Amino acid sequence: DSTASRYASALADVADVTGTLEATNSDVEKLIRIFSEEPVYYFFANPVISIDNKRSVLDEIITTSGLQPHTANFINILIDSERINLVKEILNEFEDVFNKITGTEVAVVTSVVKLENDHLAQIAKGVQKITGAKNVRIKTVIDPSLVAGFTIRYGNEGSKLVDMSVKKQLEEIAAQLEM
Amino acid sequence: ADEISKIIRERIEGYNREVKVVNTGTVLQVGDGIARIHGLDEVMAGELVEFEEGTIGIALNLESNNVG
Amino acid sequence: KKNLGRIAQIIGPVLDVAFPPGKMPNIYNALIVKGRDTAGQPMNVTCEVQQLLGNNRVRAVAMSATDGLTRGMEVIDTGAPLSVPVGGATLGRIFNVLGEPVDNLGPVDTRTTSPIHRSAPAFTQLDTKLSIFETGIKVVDLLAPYRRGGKIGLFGGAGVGKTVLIMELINNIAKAHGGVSVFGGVGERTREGNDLYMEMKESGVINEQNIAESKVALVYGQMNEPPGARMRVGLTALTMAEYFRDVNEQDVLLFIDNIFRFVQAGSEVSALLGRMPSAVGYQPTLSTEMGSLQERITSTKEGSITSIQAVYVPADDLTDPAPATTFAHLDATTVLSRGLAAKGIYPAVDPLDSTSTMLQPRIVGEEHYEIAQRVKETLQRYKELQDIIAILGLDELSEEDRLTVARARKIERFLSQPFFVAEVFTGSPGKYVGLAETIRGFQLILSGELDSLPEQAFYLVGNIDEATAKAMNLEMESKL
Amino acid sequence: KKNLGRIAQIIGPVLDVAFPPGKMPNIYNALIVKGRDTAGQPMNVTCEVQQLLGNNRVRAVAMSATDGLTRGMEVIDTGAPLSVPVGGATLGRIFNVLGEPVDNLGPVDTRTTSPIHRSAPAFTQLDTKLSIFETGIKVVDLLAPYRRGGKIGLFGGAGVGKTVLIMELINNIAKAHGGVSVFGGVGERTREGNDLYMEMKESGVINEQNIAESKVALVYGQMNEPPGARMRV
Ligand SMILES: Nc1ncnc2c1ncn2[C@@H]1O[C@H](COP(=O)(O)OP(=O)(O)OP(=O)(O)O)[C@@H](O)[C@H]1O
Ligand SMILES: Nc1ncnc2c1ncn2[C@@H]1O[C@H](COP(=O)(O)OP(=O)(O)O)[C@@H](O)[C@H]1O
């Protein structure tokens, strides 16, 4: 694994052993939305700033957004150790680890136009059957690359890919060369 | 997000402006020989920096966050 | 283009620049850095992308000096892999690796610029006509003939030859070859580059009066340039020669001096770049980079790029990776030895080690091949008797083998040459001697017909007739 | 009030100390680490700040053994580099790196002391004295004559006279040069240590009756005492 994945797995194990899992995931989404917007990330980095000031402003930004107590201790430990400069990647891989532990698996469907909810739920049935995940989450992205249908980027991270799309004519012309 | 936290944001930008000075930065680590200063996104390679105690030094290593 | 860069880190000559995510340059893509100079605002230092680090930043070696560059300086990618101006305008001017004039004349035109890092010529089109070449040197026209339109290597220790030989070879051939010559000062010392420029402009090759007429087109990435520059001035010379072989349809004669700099600068940049160190200290991709230079030099049915790289053997480590990879590419290699220079036999070309694949008999001539075989065998017998001679005395060997020893001495001194450009070191004028004349000399030397002349009568002598005359001179000076 | 920090990380004879964020010691500023190394309480593990690791942490190498040091003790900084006693009170006592006499006969007087780390003597105040001196050996007096007022090394492998020349040269010129010799053996077979100290008190240079009249100041950082010592003997 990576260090970010290790910290994310720690936070996910906490969200397991304490019954605050979905609240923890929502709080991590809030926290990564926070630790975007470069000024605050640069503030929590740049170790010349005193650790006391850093943890005090951390306490304030916790009591502002009202995070879960345990994830507040998590980001506080991240500040305590010198591995706070990884916090964006950690909160990013938390989605991976949370979904893997909870049993949900992400399926990215890319279609030329917005995909309707009924057929999206049918694609969810398909991805759920081929993978074996409980509450498969389909985050769709409208892309102009294709021509007619959809690509499914389900799997660990992008790895598996099934598609009825511009890849059809692509394979057609490519194996039409056949040289 | 960070809507009502405008006072916290003013605090963090104040602390940044306290630590983020133009052509100025702390010495993170000063080993035997080299010193590893932080900041100084204005300097070029080989720029004689001053250490405010009477010892100039050249900057041969412009890494990402710390200038060696 | 327009894709601003914001250089992140500058660790020595290697600077990596954090492009936006969507708009990232490809590998080997020139990056002109809009950066300040030591005094004044405008300065364009060039960089080529070496690898894409994947944090939206790409590592680029610097073609100009890395001093004066700010973390956060704006920089655009050209989108063109470091184009170099070639054509009729490149004739007569000393060129940087960047593709600029260094001779402070009027600037060149950008009408026929060419990319510097291009793909190799395909094996489907390779002209292979085996034709011997008469350079002018006794030994390396006889003992190791050169392949016209084929690579040639002047290996040697630090200062045994390989630059005075390059100067004499260009002084000989660059007049004869109708096609132009493209000299590349790859990491050569600047003062020898100055000497070569002066010698070219005095020998009518440059023709300073009509600069657009010259039969030579220099590029200097000389010794005092950042390791990016010496990494690619060889490719600049190759781009000029490849243009003159792809379009102008003329056989060109590129002299690269110290091709070992094209590997050592690669070492100094590969250390910082993040690539792991290889054997004795060179880059990992020593062989593939060296091949990326050497393979583009091939006679390709439109012309013939004959080339003489003055490979530098690091402290005469003839097993080091930098010459060990170039021996595979170099057809008519010529190992110059400090051992045969410390005794003053110049040129310091080794009679044994210097070998060529043009010494096949049906290619080089049967009698010439036989004389070369007999000379090499006599020198090998002398090198094997060097241990008996040095320890047990010259007398303790046979009296036929003593004739072979004296004959080997006569031969290894006769294959000395007064160069025209080495007259300042010798003090004596130079004698250019053809191929058939050195064959006719060696025939009479090793046929035992003239084993009476003193050994010094064969030293630094143009032809066997001049050796006969020097024998008379020495016999008169002995009693007088 | 010398600001004390807590020792955090210990790697052999090199220990990293965490200080309060305000005041970190200067380079080479001695940290006499307090604490306990036995049933009693000797606070004799002194260390010297080699390099500032940043984030109020300093690597300090210990001039003694680091056994008996727990992560989380209390260390103080003297404020000045490691001070050793010098002067007339020094002449005639086997010294360690710390500055305490090992011959356990006289507790030294540290009123006249100096830090071990000093800047080089400036270029102006050197000597134009280029005088030859006579050692008392044929070879090193004829072929490579030694130089008064200069550093005179004698290289050599193991087991080849490299210490018998030092001892014989001591024997030849110790009383002749009325200047007080200072044997500073760094990495010395301490058996040769007792041999040399006994030869000194036999040859009459160091006096078992009078300490001031000894005109020699041995310093022993013998081949033990992890390299915090042998780097500073
Ligand atoms: N004049 C001499 N007569 C007899 N033996 C001698 C003489 N000079 C030197 N030796 C030999 O040299 C050896 C001393 O070895 P050496 O001087 O290399 O030790 P060293 O490494 O210098 O010791 P240290 O580490 O204390 O400096 C002795 O064992 C001795 O046998
Ligand atoms: N024919 C010769 N006569 C006299 N001296 C020579 C001759 N050839 C070479 N030398 C001496 O040997 C040196 C070898 O050339 P040099 O330019 O040093 O090679 P490199 O460029 O590899 O250092 C010359 O500088 C010259 O002094």
CATH of the domain at B37: 2.40.30.20
Residue D150 burial (10 A CB sphere; 0-12, 13-18, 19+): exposed
Cβ of residue D191 lying under 6 Å from some atom of ligand 1: no
Among C10, C36, C73, C75, which would you mutate to test the B interface (most chain B Cβ atoms within 10 Å of its Cβ)?
C10
Label the pairing between strands C57-62 and C113-114. unpaired
CB contact under 8 A, D54 and A47: yes
Whether cis (ω within 30° of 0) applies to the bond prior to C81 is no
Task: Give dist(CA D79, CA D76) in Å, integer.
Answer: 9
User: Is A8 in the same domain as A18?
Assistant: yes
Task: Give dist(CA D98, CA A94) in Å, integer.
Answer: 53
Label the pairing between strands C253-257 and C306-310. parallel
Strand, helix or coil for residue D9: strand
- The phi, psi pair for B59, rounded to 5°, reads -115, 95
Residue D157 annotated as part of some ligand binding site: yes
Does any domain span residue B5?
no
**Does C have 3 or more CB contacts under 8 Å with B?**
yes
Does any domain span residue B8?
no
Strand, helix or coil for residue D82: coil
How many Å is the Cα radius of gyration of chain C? 25
- The phi, psi pair for D9, rounded to 5°, reads -125, 130
Strand, helix or coil for residue A142: strand
For residue C425, report the distance from its CA to the centre of ligand 2, in Å. 8
Which ligand ends up closest to the CA of C418? 2
Does any domain span residue B14?
no
Query: What are the residues facing C30 on neighbouring strands?
Result: C48
- The phi, psi pair for A171, rounded to 5°, reads -65, -35
Q: Quick one: which atom of ligand 1 is closest to the CA of D188?
A: 26
Does any domain span residue B13?
no
Partner C contacted by B58 (CB < 8 A): no
Chains in contact with C, where contact requires at least 3 CB pairs less than 8 Å apart? B
How many Å is the Cα radius of gyration of chain D? 20
Read off the tokens for A35. 């630790």
User: Is A27 in the same domain as A61?
Assistant: yes
Give residue B67's domain range: 20-68
Chains in contact with D, where contact requires at least 3 CB pairs less than 8 Å apart? A, B
Task: Give dist(CA C388, CA C394) in Å, integer.
Answer: 8
D62: enclosing H helix or E strand: strand D57-62
> Ligand 1 atom 30: the closest Cα is on which residue?
D161
Longest alpha-carbon distance in chain C: 88
Structural biology method used: cryo-EM
User: Is A85 in the same domain as A163?
Assistant: no
User: Is A8 in the same domain as A93?
Assistant: yes
Cβ of residue C162 lying under 6 Å from some atom of ligand 2: yes
* Strand ranges across the sheet with A109-111: A141-142, A109-111, A150-152, A162-164
Distance of CA A66 to the CA centre of its chain: 21
Cβ of residue C425 lying under 6 Å from some atom of ligand 2: yes
Does any domain span residue B65?
yes
Distance from CA of B55 to the nearest CA of D (A): 14
Least Cα distance to C245 among C176, C314, C298, C323 occurs for C298
Of A46, A48, A64, the CB nearest to B5: A64
Task: Give dist(CA C324, CA D150) in Å, integer.
Answer: 49
User: Is A95 in the same domain as A81?
Assistant: yes
Read off the tokens for C180. 């132009």
Measure the N-to-C terminal CA separation of chain D; round to a whole number of Å. Answer: 29
Positive or negative torsion for Cα C285, C286, C287, C290: positive
Q: Quick one: which atom of ligand 2 is closest to the CA of C310?
A: 22
User: Is A40 in the same domain as A80?
Assistant: yes
Residues of B with CB under 8 A from a CB of A: 1-2, 4-5, 8-9, 11-13, 15-16, 19-20, 25-26, 28, 38-39, 65
Cβ of residue D160 lying under 6 Å from some atom of ligand 1: yes
Residue where a domain stops, chosen among A80, A103, A126: A103
Task: Give dist(CA B63, CA C471) in Å, integer.
Answer: 70
Measure the N-to-C terminal CA separation of chain A; round to a whole number of Å. Answer: 42
Partner D contacted by B31 (CB < 8 A): yes
Reduced 3-state DSSP string for chain C: CCCCCCEEEEECCEEEEECCCCCCCCCCCEEEEECCCCCCCCCEEEEEEEEECCCCEEEEEECCCCCCCECCCCEEECCCCCCEECCCCCCCCCECCCCCECCCCCCCCCCCEECCCCCCCCCCCCCCCCCEECCCCHHHHHCCCEECCCEEEEEECCCCCCCHHHHHHHHHHHHHCCCCECCEEECCCHHHHHHHHHHHHHCCCCCCCCHHHCCECCEEECCCCCHHHHCCHHHHHHHHHHHHHHCCCCCCEEEEECCCHHHHHHHHHHHHHCCCCCCCCCCCCHHHHHHHHHCCCCCCCCCCCEEEEECCCHHHCCCCHHHHCHHHHCCEEEEECCHHHHCCCCCCECCCCCCCCCCCHHHHCHHHHHHHHHHHHHHHHHHHHHHHHHHHCHHHCCCCHHHHHHHHHHHHHHCCCCCCCCHHHHCCCCCCCCHHHHHHHHHHHHCCCCCCCCHHHHCCCCCHHHHHHHHHHHHHHHHC
Angle between helices C233-246 and C286-294 (to 10 degrees): 30
The residues of C carrying an active-site annotation are 162, 188-189
Positive or negative torsion for Cα C234, C236, C241, C247: positive
User: Is A72 in the same domain as A46?
Assistant: yes
Task: Give dist(CA C365, CA D219) in Å, integer.
Answer: 82
Q: Residue C328: CB partners within 8 Å, gap ≥ 6?
A: none
Q: Quick one: which atom of ligand 1 is closest to the CA of D157?
A: 18
D188 is catalytic: yes
Alpha helices in A103-143 (DSSP H): 117-131
Residue D193 half-sphere exposure, CB side, CA atoms within 13 Å? 22
Confirm if A106 and A133 have CB atoms less than 8 A apart: no
Partner B contacted by C372 (CB < 8 A): no
CB contact under 8 A, B25 and A60: no
Q: Which one from D188, D215, D225, D232 is the annotated catalytic residue?
A: D188
B32 contact residues in D (CB cutoff 8 A): 27, 50-51
Positive or negative torsion for Cα D169, D171, D175, D179: positive
CB contact under 8 A, B44 and C8: no
For residue C325, report the distance from its CA to the centre of ligand 2, in Å. 25
Read off the tokens for B32. 């035997």
For residue C409, report the distance from its CA to the centre of ligand 2, in Å. 22
User: Is A79 in the same domain as A13?
Assistant: yes
User: Is A160 in the same domain as A73?
Assistant: no
User: Is A124 in the same domain as A65?
Assistant: no
Q: For B66, which residue in chain C has the nearest alpha carbon?
A: C9
Q: Which one from D23, D36, D189, D191 is the annotated catalytic residue?
A: D189
Least Cα distance to C19 among C51, C45, C57, C73 occurs for C57
Query: What are the residues facing C256 on neighbouring strands?
Result: C184, C309
Q: Quick one: which atom of ligand 2 is closest to the CA of C165?
A: 8
User: Is A73 in the same domain as A149?
Assistant: no
- The phi, psi pair for C216, rounded to 5°, reads -145, 150
- Ordered structural domains, chain C, with CATH: 1-81 (2.40.10.170), 82-358 (3.40.50.300), 359-478 (1.10.1140.10)
Tell me the helix, strand and coil percentages in chain A, rounded to 5: 60, 10, 30
Give residue A29's domain range: 1-103
Least Cα distance to C416 among C325, C320, C341, C470 occurs for C341
Distance from CA of B12 to the nearest CA of A (A): 7
Task: Give dist(CA A109, CA A56) in Å, integer.
Answer: 42
Of D51, D54, D55, the CB nearest to B32: D51
User: Is A23 in the same domain as A93?
Assistant: yes
Task: Give dist(CA C411, CA C442) in Å, integer.
Answer: 7
> Ligand 2 atom 21: the closest Cα is on which residue?
C163
Does any domain span residue B61?
yes
**How many domains does chain A contain in total?**
2
Distance from CA of B61 to the nearest CA of C (A): 5
Least Cα distance to D54 among B65, A164, C1, C346 occurs for B65
Cβ of residue D161 lying under 6 Å from some atom of ligand 1: yes
Does any domain span residue B45?
yes
Strand, helix or coil for residue D219: strand
Confirm if C163 and C155 have CB atoms less than 8 A apart: no
Q: Resolution in angstroms for this experimental structure?
A: 4.0
Least Cα distance to D183 among D158, D211, D215 occurs for D215
Task: Give dist(CA C84, CA D229) in Å, integer.
Answer: 62
Does any domain span residue B52?
yes
**How many domains does chain B contain in total?**
1
